[PDB]
Structure formats: structure tokens, C-alpha cells
Amino acid sequence: MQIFVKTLTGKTITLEVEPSDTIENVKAKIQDKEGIPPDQQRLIFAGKQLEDGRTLSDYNIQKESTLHLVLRLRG
């Protein structure tokens, strides 16, 4: 299925996932589409921070739910 990842800037990144996919897997997917490593990523689904090895279906995340990406960058 497809789900949407929104960013601070307003951009919307679309992903090919299945409800079985781990959060960590979704982060791997954001890398190849964007360039940002998993390290620098936190995913929020209204409105908890999501745990790396704990599945979309686990968080009740559907076909075309929208998630939010925030960045952990070393300044």
C-alpha cells in the first residue's frame, strides 16, 4: 500500500509499504527516496513518536495514512 510522510517544509514523501513493515523498514525506505539515514529520522503518527521495530499495523496505520517526519541532525 501507499502511505504519506509529511515534513516540516510541507513536502509530502509517498512510500510503498505493507502493514507488516517495521518503522525501521519505513526509515530505510525514506533513505533511498530522500538520502537521509534512519539515524536522523523520527516518525510521528498523531501524535506519538514511533518505535523502530514495531510495525505499521501495530500502530493502526492504514492505506494512505499520513505520518510526520522530524529530523535529528547534528549541529
Binding site: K6, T7, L8, T9, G10, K11, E34, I36, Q40, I44, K48, Q49, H68, L69, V70, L71, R72, L73, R74, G75
Partner: protein, 231 residues
């Protein structure tokens, strides 16, 4: 080289503030730029992180590059003027001593503080930079530690929300990067929400309102769980 880099994480920044000896604040991460934060008021400042593309306002300029996280945060705190907020002895003594020093000399003094260097390092080629936004009297200022002076972005009030000016400046800064650049982070420095709920809870307790006390317990528990996930 003797200062580590610091991750753009609202939990780390909340702890750095406390580490510097300042009480009454916390840091909240912003997730969208249209996020209404009316409920987070007062907002004491913003901390903004982006990729570096190479008299009433307190401001220090950096003389070391890797200090930018602590320096941006301190530039924000030393412009805070609020009953909610106590800077603590370390930061008050720093501000008093450096009151008539030029901006780069302030950076030097900050850099030589052992307490500040200690706190900073206890939390740690594209370069990512932190800058601060803060209101002072009727102006709104961007405090970029690479510049020699604060940058006035605009004027505010009477009705005014100062945050509109800052957010406008930040959006327009984002419009300078590839429409595909997404590596930014925005945090707001706000009053301690747990402390706010505990004050209200003790008042409703005194008023005999069990229902409101329980709901405040729920808010507090929610706040604690959120703080724990940031750990």
C-alpha cells in the same frame, strides 16, 4: 574540535537549559510550520537548524564553530524576560559580566566558561547550524552566531503575535533551498508545562474539585510519558 556537535532534539535542549542552571522552561519540537501553538504560549523563542550555505538585545558571536548549539541557546535565554523564568546564577553572572563587551568577546567568554563547556559536551562535509529567534521590546530578531550583530526581522504589536514575524522569516529562509531539501528542524522554547499543570492542580485540589485534579493528573502523566520517550 574540543566541542562536540549537538543533535537537534528537544529533549537534549531542555536538559541543556537545566544544565546551565535555568529553570521554568522546556523545548517543544515543531512538526509543521502552520502548527497553531496558541496553547503553548508564551513562546520565549525559536531554535532553528538548517544546512549552512557558505542595544537592548543580548547577542554573542561565535569564535568557535562547534559551539553553535550552546551559543544559540544561550543567546535566546539571555533575552528572556519573564516571571516564569529564572536564569540561575551561572547565566546571570555571565550576562552581568559581559554586559558591555562586544559580541565576539562575549563568544570568547562563553567559550572559556568551564560550566558551559561541560554542559555542552555532556550531550554529544555538510555543516548544520543552529540560530535563535527572539522578541525584544517591539522588535523580532534573528540571532545568527556567525554574524557580528542581531538581525531585526520586523516590528510587532499592539495586538501582535511576534511568532508570525519569526515564522515568516523562517519560511522565507526555507525558500532558498531545493524544493526537495527537507533537512531542517524547528523547536520552540516554552514555559515548563508540567510545572504549570502542578500549580493548577494544587489550586483545584484546594478548591475541592476532584474531577479537574484527575484531568490534570492525566495531562501530567501524558507530559511525563512524552518526556520519557525523549530519553
Amino acid at each position: 574540535g574540543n566541542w562536540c556537535l549537538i543533535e537537534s532534539d528537544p529533549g537534549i535542549f531542555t536538559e541543556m537549559i537545566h544544565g546551565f542552571g535555568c529553570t521554568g522552561l522546556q523545548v517543544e519540537e515543531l512538526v509543521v510550520l502552520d502548527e497553531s501553538i496558541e496553547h503553548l504560549k508564551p513562546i520565549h523563542g525559536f531554535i532553528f537548524l538548517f544546512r549552512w550555505l557558505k542595544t537592548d538585545v543580548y547577542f554573542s558571536q561565535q569564535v568557535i564553530q562547534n559551539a553553535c548549539a550552546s551559543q544559540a541557546l544561550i543567546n535566546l535565554l539571555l533575552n528572556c524576560d519573564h516571571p516564569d523564568v529564572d536564569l540561575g546564577p551561572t547565566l546571570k553572572e555571565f550576562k552581568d559580566f559581559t554586559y558591555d563587551l562586544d559580541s565576539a568577546s562575549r563568544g570568547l567568554c562563553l567559550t572559556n566558561s568551564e560550566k558551559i563547556r561541560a554542559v555542552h559536551n555532556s550531550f554529544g562535509e555538510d555543516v548544520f547550524h543552529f540560530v535563535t529567534y527572539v522578541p525584544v521590546n517591539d522588535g523580532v530578531y534573528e540571532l545568527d552566531g556567525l554574524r557580528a550583530a542581531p538581525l531585526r526581522l520586523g516590528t510587532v504589536a499592539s495586538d501582535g503575535d511576534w511568532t508570525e514575524v519569526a515564522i515568516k522569516a523562517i519560511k522565507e529562509k526555507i525558500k532558498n533551498y531545493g524544493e526537495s531539501e527537507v533537512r531542517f528542524n524547528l523547536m520552540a522554547v516554552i514555559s515548563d508545562q508540567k510545572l504549570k499543570y502542578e500549580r493548577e492542580m494544587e489550586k483545584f485540589a484546594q478548591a475541592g474539585d476532584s474531577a479537574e485534579v484527575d484531568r490534570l493528573v492525566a495531562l501530567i502523566a501524558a507530559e511525563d510519558a512524552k518526556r520519557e520517550r525523549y530519553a
